[PDB]
Design a protein around this ligand. Structure first.
Ligand SMILES: [K+]
Ligand SMILES: [K+]
Ligand SMILES: [Mg+2]
Ligand SMILES: [Mg+2]
Ligand SMILES: [Mg+2]
Lengths: 113, 158, 148, 59, 98, 54, 61, 216
RNA sequence: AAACCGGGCACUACGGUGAGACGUGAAAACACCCGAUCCCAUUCCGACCUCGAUAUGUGGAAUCGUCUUGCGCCAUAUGUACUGAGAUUGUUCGGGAGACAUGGUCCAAGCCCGGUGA
RNA sequence: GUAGGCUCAAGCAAAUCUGCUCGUGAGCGUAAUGGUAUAAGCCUGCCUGACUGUGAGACCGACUGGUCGAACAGAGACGAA
């Protein structure tokens, strides 16, 4: 079969403009919060950063992704974004590093929409 | 540590680099999997047919919709199965067939007759037609497969 | 095909609407597809499968008598028109409406510029005279066309 | 590999025709592991021809 | 002689009820159809027989996908988009305070 | 004329007499239906047991 | 492999076309395989002698 | 090297006429029917370089008697694989020559019932331009063929071959020799003796003519 | 600092999707090469996915480039079919395909993180 | 009903698994038509929203009458959400 192109979730009543997107490589972990109307990066946290890639030993595993999620949640709460909506890619399930990032953000205190 | 894959990595890889034209060291053929499937006319019901498959493979088979039975062997289990069959191969002249990338072997009851560990409990394997054993290799050419099998089939006789 | 008389072995539906056939042209011109000579139509109308078979039989019987021996089958014929529309009909002494009548035969819709027949492997004069003989069995006006 | 689904294994020893030792795994059907020696049991069979059969008698 | 064919069914009145650029208020039925000939877009809901209706007061816009040929119907809202009440409670309070 | 189905009453076991009218086939079964459904006269989900239609 | 590729290019023409031919002769079956124990010295010839003493004479039909 | 090689056919000097045209001011069936009633065939001259934005087109009308004479004398396919001189003047009998150019007849439209010309198309082919030309075939040597002598019949699979041709050396026709074909064999599109600068558009393993055995 | 390169998001059929040939792994990035102990995967299997590990190997599979190209897609004819109004029993005025033919595969382009520049 | 997972049919190579072409041609109890690929299809776990009282606004129309539906209150099922 030919895989059809993915669409963003349908607008129903309210906008919900902040979208959390995650990415994991062999060496680092990245997480971004995107503002949908302007198509800009509102917030970001990754283990590739200059202020983060030396303060943690392992930059690739579940513990590193959980630390990155905690940092991103505190950055969102100081940049005043009370809630985010999670976007999951073609192969990501609620398991492992994705689960660590989501639970770290929720324990940091961001509501999930 | 183990004789079969150690022998492959230490002897056959260098000689297969030297014998053929290769652009890289990752183009060397290797060893992927072993697929064992019983011969066509059989019972589907008796416990002998299930046990005579579970014993020489070492892992549970799959029985799909009851008309098909299969076992796939990968990794160190595949290496143990291969080093058993290649050792028992040295007591006779069992025919094999070389396809484009794989080796076909016929696992008859006369094989388990000569297997020294299966001399006992032979009534399991009695009244069984046999199996078909497939050895899949990552080979581009039938001649690469033939060279690889001729390397792997070693004895101290001759 | 069905040997001589040409109609489909089976159809999707037994009875078809009448439709219209008095109009229609080839909007791009016409050229021969297989043969060197051919017969094409100048008008548009209907032809029955019996008329098409009679015309084909006339051409092959003219070649049969003009050329014998090993050249007897050197003439080749292509029939490019096919009759696949059943026509119906009610018998005598019947009133108007109790459904639709039984099928009686098959027709072909012919447009202006449609090539009915194609000929190869013969002489120019034999082809012209076979076209002359075949056009006397068809109700439509035909022309002899030549490859160029 | 799933758990609670496959047979147990056991270690047995093979001795080749030259006396070389080799350790392998096998499905556990014995109480203790054993050592199995390999011989030259090739069992190659040959049949004589008709001229050979003729010469075995009439000469 | 006897025919066996005299049956038909009552008309169903399908089709597009609100074309492109039409002004709709919430609850209005846009397209009544058998199967999703048109797929729902923004602010357009769908019923159990694939009837498309409008959820916000606005103007009907159509959309076509160029590769696959799929079609969507959106409604452009009259006053623009509305943000979530959690943002209006928190971020708009801090927006007024800053 | 012959009907292949019949109607039954799922009766509330709370004793309020509230019943649902359901439908089952007449080909043959032995397991009497029971469900956990809403009884509005007691405002709680209770157990409903099949009884024959009168 | 890089050094072999460099070695094939420092040859004359016909000598290079000869040495570009792939080797397809199969491996020898009499070369050994490594294992956990070296061969016993008085084992293999003993097994061969026993096998030929068994295969001596002809079996009765 | 842009000249016909020896041993090759050349365009004839008998049919080397010049085509006279006058400008046409509009497109459509109204003005087309008016020009046809007046006795002229509508036409357009265009170039290759800009397929979009028209293509430097000029709308003209040519003389029906001349065009019908050319098509009848040459043949339909032979008229389409030969270059011509086109001379566009402001009026018939005028000397105000607007454009003289060397052009290829890209297509001609004939009525399917009456075969009168309805439209002629001209594409500017000065030297140095590449065209897709459909060249007719001419079959010779059918009296020498042993297969045809033995009573076999001829199966002409293809009549025209499509080539990519520079303008200067477009062949009028391709001579195909049937002297040395016996029963059973066929000629493919790779056996055509053409100029080496012509590229065959169709694959070379395409049959052209096969001599098949007769009904014994 | 302003340019270039790598990764993620965003724009998009002239920006799509296949095939062939030639290259590329910058002190960095991506992927593979290795393993199956815990999480997960398999109605058998680390094949897929997942989880661990890799001072430096390889671009064999994928990923990036350059050209050739096949379908598509975009733009544009000329002519014909068909058609709205009108009866010189359609002598007028308008619209205009399909299939051919000709060219192209553009231009422009935002946010963040990392590196070289600094 | 819900949550999670999976992707058919046909052709070719090996001659029922594994890979390549193609794209709705498989399935959706039941006729035909329209629809459908991280599903509306197939599997597994748990369930009974196959609830109670209402309903802005529309689509059919001689009338009797029929269809879609955001949302409100009570009690619940599945899901980390
Ligand atoms: K279920
Ligand atoms: K509610
Ligand atoms: Mg016009
Ligand atoms: Mg067009
Ligand atoms: Mg799901």
């Amino acid at each position: 079969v030919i895989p059809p192109a993915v669409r963003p979730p349908r607008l129903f009543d309210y906008l919900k403009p902040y979208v959390l997107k995650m990415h994991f490589t062999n060496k680092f972990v990245h997480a971004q919060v995107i503002h949908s109307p302007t198509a800009t990066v509102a917030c970001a946290a990754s283990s590739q950063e200059k202020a983060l890639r030396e303060t943690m030993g392992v930059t690739r595993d579940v513990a590193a992704a959980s630390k990155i999620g905690k940092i991103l949640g505190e950055r969102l709460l100081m940049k005043d974004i009370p809630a985010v909506a999670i976007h999951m890619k073609k192969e990501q399930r609620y398991h492992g590093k994705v689960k660590a990032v989501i639970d770290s953000v929720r324990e940091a205190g961001v509501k999930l929409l | 540590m183990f004789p079969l894959n150690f022998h492959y990595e230490d002897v056959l890889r260098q000689d297969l680099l030297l014998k053929l034209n290769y652009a890289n060291v990752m183009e060397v053929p290797g060893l992927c999997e072993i697929r064992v499937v019983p011969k066509a006319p059989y019972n589907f019901i008796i416990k002998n047919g299930k046990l005579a498959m579970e014993i020489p493979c070492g892992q549970k088979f799959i029985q799909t919709q009851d008309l098909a039975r299969q076992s796939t062997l990968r990794g160190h289990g595949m290496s143990n199965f291969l080093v058993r069959i290649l050792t028992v191969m040295s007591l006779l002249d069992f025919p094999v067939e070389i396809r484009k990338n794989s080796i076909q072997f016929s696992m008859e009851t006369e094989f388990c007759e000569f297997s020294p560990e299966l001399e006992d409990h032979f009534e399991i394997f009695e009244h069984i037609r046999g199996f078909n054993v497939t050895i899949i290799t990552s080979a581009n050419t039938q001649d690469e497969t033939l060279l690889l099998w001729s390397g792997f089939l070693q004895k101290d006789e001759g | 095909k069905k040997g001589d008389v040409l109609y489909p072995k089976r159809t999707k539906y037994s009875k078809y609407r009448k439709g219209r056939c008095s109009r229609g042209c080839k909007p791009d011109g016409t050229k021969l597809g297989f043969g060197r000579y051919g017969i094409k139509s100048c008008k548009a109308g209907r032809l029955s499968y019996r008329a098409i078979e009679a015309a084909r039989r006339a051409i092959i019987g003219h070649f049969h008598r003009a050329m014998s021996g090993q050249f007897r089958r050197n003439g080749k014929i292509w029939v490019r028109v096919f009759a696949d529309l059943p026509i119906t009909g009610k018998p005598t002494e019947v009133r108007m409406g109790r459904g639709k009548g039984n099928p009686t035969g098959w027709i072909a819709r012919v447009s202006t510029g449609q090539i009915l027949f194609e000929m190869d492997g013969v002489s120019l004069a034999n082809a012209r005279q076979a076209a002359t003989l075949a056009a006397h069995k068809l109700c439509l006006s035909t022309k002899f066309v030549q490859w160029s | 590999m799933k758990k609670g689904v496959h047979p147990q294994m056991q270690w047995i020893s093979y001795v080749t025709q030259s006396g070389r030792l080799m350790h392998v795994m096998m499905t556990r059907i014995h109480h203790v592991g054993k050592v199995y020696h390999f011989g030259a049991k090739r069992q190659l069979a040959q049949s004589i021809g008709q001229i050979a059969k003729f010469k075995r008698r009439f000469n | 002689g006897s025919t066996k064919n005299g049956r038909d069914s009552k008309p169903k009145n399908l089709g597009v009820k609100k074309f492109g650029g039409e002004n709709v208020i919430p609850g209005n039925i846009i397209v009544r159809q058998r199967g999703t000939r048109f797929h729902p877009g923004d602010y357009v809901g769908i019923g159990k027989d694939h009837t498309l209706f409008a959820l916000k007061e606005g103007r009907v816009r159509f959309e076509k996908n160029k590769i696959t040929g799929r079609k969507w119907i959106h409604v452009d809202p009259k006053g623009g988009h509305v943000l979530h009440p959690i943002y209006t409670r928190a971020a708009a309070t801090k927006s007024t305070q800053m | 004329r012959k009907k292949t189905f019949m109607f039954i009453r799922l009766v509330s076991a709370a004793g309020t007499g509230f019943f649902y009218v359901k439908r089952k086939s007449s080909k043959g079964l032995l397991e009497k239906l029971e469900f956990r459904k809403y009884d509005p006269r007691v405002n709680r989900h209770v157990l409903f047991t099949e009884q024959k239609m009168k | 492999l890089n050094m072999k590729k460099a070695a094939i290019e420092a040859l004359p023409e016909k000598l290079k076309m000869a040495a570009l031919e792939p080797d397809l002769t199969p491996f020898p079956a009499n070369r050994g395989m490594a294992t956990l124990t070296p061969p016993i010295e008085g084992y293999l010839e003993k097994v061969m002698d026993a096998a030929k003493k068994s295969s001596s004479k002809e079996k009765l039909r | 090297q842009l000249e016909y090689l020896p041993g090759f056919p050349r365009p004839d000097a008998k049919h080397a006429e010049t085509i006279l045209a006058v400008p046409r001011s509009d497109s459509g069936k109204n003005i087309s029917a008016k020009e046809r009633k007046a006795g002229r065939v509508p036409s357009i001259i265009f170039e290759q370089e800009d397929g979009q934005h028209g293509g430097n087109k000029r709308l003209v009308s040519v003389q029906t008697n001349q065009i019908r004479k050319l098509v009848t004398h040459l043949g339909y396919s032979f008229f389409l694989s030969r270059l011509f001189d086109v001379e566009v003047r402001s009026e018939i009998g005028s000397d105000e020559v607007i454009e003289k150019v060397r052009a290829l007849p890209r297509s001609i439209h004939l009525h399917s019932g009456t075969d009168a010309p309805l439209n002629v198309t001209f594409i500017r082919a000065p030297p140095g331009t590449l065209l897709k030309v459909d060249i007719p075939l001419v079959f010779i040597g059918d009296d020498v063929s042993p297969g045809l002598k033995k009573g076999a019949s001829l199966n002409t699979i293809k009549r025209t071959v499509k080539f990519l041709c520079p303008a200067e050396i477009v062949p009028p026709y391709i001579e195909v020799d049937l002297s040395l074909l016996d029963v059973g064999q066929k000629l493919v599109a790779g056996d055509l003796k053409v100029h080496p600068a012509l590229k065959l558009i169709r694959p070379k393993d395409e049959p052209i003519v096969k001599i098949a055995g007769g009904r014994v």
